Amino acid sequence: APALAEVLAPTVPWPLSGKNPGALQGQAARLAAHLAEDHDLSLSDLGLSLATTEHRAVVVLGSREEALGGLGALGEQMPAGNVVTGAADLSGKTVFVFPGQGSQWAGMAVELLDSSPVFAARFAEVAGAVEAYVDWSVESVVRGADEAPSLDRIEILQPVLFTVMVSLAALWRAAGVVPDAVVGHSQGEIAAAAVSGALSLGDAAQVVVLRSQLFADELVGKGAVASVSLPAAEVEARIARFNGDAELLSIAGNNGPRSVTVAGQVAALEELVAELEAEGVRAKVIGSTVASHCAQVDPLHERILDLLSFVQPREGSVPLYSTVNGEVLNGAELDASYWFENCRRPVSFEPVVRALFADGFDVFVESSAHPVLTYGISETAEAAGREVLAQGTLRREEGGLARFYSSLAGVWTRGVDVDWAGAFAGRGARVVD
Numbered sequence: 001a002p003a004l005a006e007v008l009a010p011t012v013p014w015p016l017s018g019k020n021p022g023a024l025q026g027q028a029a030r031l032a033a034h035l036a037e038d039h040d041l042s043l044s045d046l047g048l049s050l051a052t053t054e055h056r057a058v059v060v061l062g063s064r065e066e067a068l069g070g071l072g073a074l075g076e077q078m079p080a081g082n083v084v085t086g087a088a089d090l091s092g093k094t095v096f097v098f099p100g101q102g103s104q105w106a107g108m109a110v111e112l113l114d115s116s117p118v119f120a121a122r123f124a125e126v127a128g129a130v131e132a133y134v135d136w137s138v139e140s141v142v143r144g145a146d147e148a149p150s151l152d153r154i155e156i157l158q159p160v161l162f163t164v165m166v167s168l169a170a171l172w173r174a175a176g177v178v179p180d181a182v183v184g185h186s187q188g189e190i191a192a193a194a195v196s197g198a199l200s201l202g203d204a205a206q207v208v209v210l211r212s213q214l215f216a217d218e219l220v221g222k223g224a225v226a227s228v229s230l231p232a233a234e235v236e237a238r239i240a241r242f243n244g245d246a247e248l249l250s251i252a253g254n255n256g257p258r259s260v261t262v263a264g265q266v267a268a269l270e271e272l273v274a275e276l277e278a279e280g281v282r283a284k285v286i287g288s289t290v291a292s293h294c295a296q297v298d299p300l301h302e303r304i305l306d307l308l309s310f311v312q313p314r315e316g317s318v319p320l321y322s323t324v325n326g327e328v329l330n331g332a333e334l335d336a337s338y339w340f341e342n343c344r345r346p347v348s349f350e351p352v353v354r355a356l357f358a359d360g361f362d363v364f365v366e367s368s369a370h371p372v373l374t375y376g377i378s379e380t381a382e383a384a385g386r387e388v389l390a391q392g393t394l395r396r397e398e399g400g401l402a403r404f405y406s407s408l409a410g411v412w413t414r415g416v417d418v419d420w421a422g423a424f425a426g427r428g429a430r431v432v433d
Helices: 023-038 043-052 064-075 110-115 117-133 138-142 154-174 188-196 201-218 232-239 266-278 295-307 336-344 349-359 374-383 401-412
Strands: 012-018 055-061 083-087 094-098 181-184 224-228 249-256 259-264 283-285 363-366 389-391
Touching: 012 023, 012 043, 012 064, 012 401, 023 043, 023 055, 023 064, 055 064, 055 401, 064 083, 083 401, 094 154, 094 188, 110 117, 110 138, 110 154, 110 401, 117 138, 117 154, 117 201, 138 154, 154 188, 154 201, 181 188, 181 349, 188 201, 201 295, 201 336, 224 249, 224 266, 232 249, 232 259, 232 266, 249 266, 249 349, 249 374, 259 266, 259 374, 266 283, 295 336, 349 374, 363 374, 374 389, 389 401
Parallel strands: 094 181, 094 363, 363 389
Antiparallel strands: 012 055, 055 083, 224 259, 224 283, 249 259
């Protein structure tokens, strides 16, 4: 039942397609002139009409003005922020990417709760699973209720992030976009397991909640993870001087050929990050993160096997590419042992991005509040001579239908199928010739 969109939300997407020279531009030019001249054709009717009918574009609009501004611009081959353009030259094999921490911002799920029924119904269903293992309400933390806990706290961030990522994947699925596979980074593998069905909701919810509550008890204060824009070899050489007495700092992830993470002791991490920043290199402590993917997780080994003994794994609808052991898992192999490897081992994301290229994936949808792994996939694609689409869902301070229809356009304009008519459900629009 529940639609992409509240009937009273004004953001709507207009899709246009052409194959002949200047055909997309001509069709846009004429429609903009007709809209202004006709003064009777309904905006909603024109939308559903365009939505139900090789070179592609989507105008994302909340208003007649934005419609004329978009078609007008497309008509004169001028770029605009609300007109998403592309060529439909991709096979469309799609993988959903579920990142770790870094995605979060303060109002992230709020707009989609208020304006997308589908997102709201999935959010409740997934919030309901986590809330079985927790005293607080996911929805109130997202809306910043006064009395609800903060997202700064790891044990609250990870379950919140889990719910938002799984619910975003359902919003993609309603709009007719369906993964052929999933891929997770760090905690992201939990969300990836939920969406694939490899864990039940309740199992995936219990894993995220218990493993983040452990990290909060045992690891907060003592460690973090930082994102560094240099290749592995350069970074091994910059941390060596910190690791005299003890290994304070270690490479916890490979995201691209020029992109890695470092995990360990907060002071040494912050010094390396300041050193590299002074030198014009991007290095940033990932928000609220603990020193996972390093030796600090080892004193937690037996606790973690006991905590996640419940986990019952099973084949999902769709394979999971393991960022932990380079295997393509049906879903049954995700036992408590796997979930220890996941928080201890460094995340070999980049090599499984190359494996996905070789198995025929050319569309990567990152199901997140803010795109963080998208640059690594694009850098990997360039270095592999592969033309691929790396598409985020939301961004900071853009959590609405305008942002989401933009990212949906991103995938459609490059050849992935989308039910655009879904955006007009229940509005009483009629297709007009």
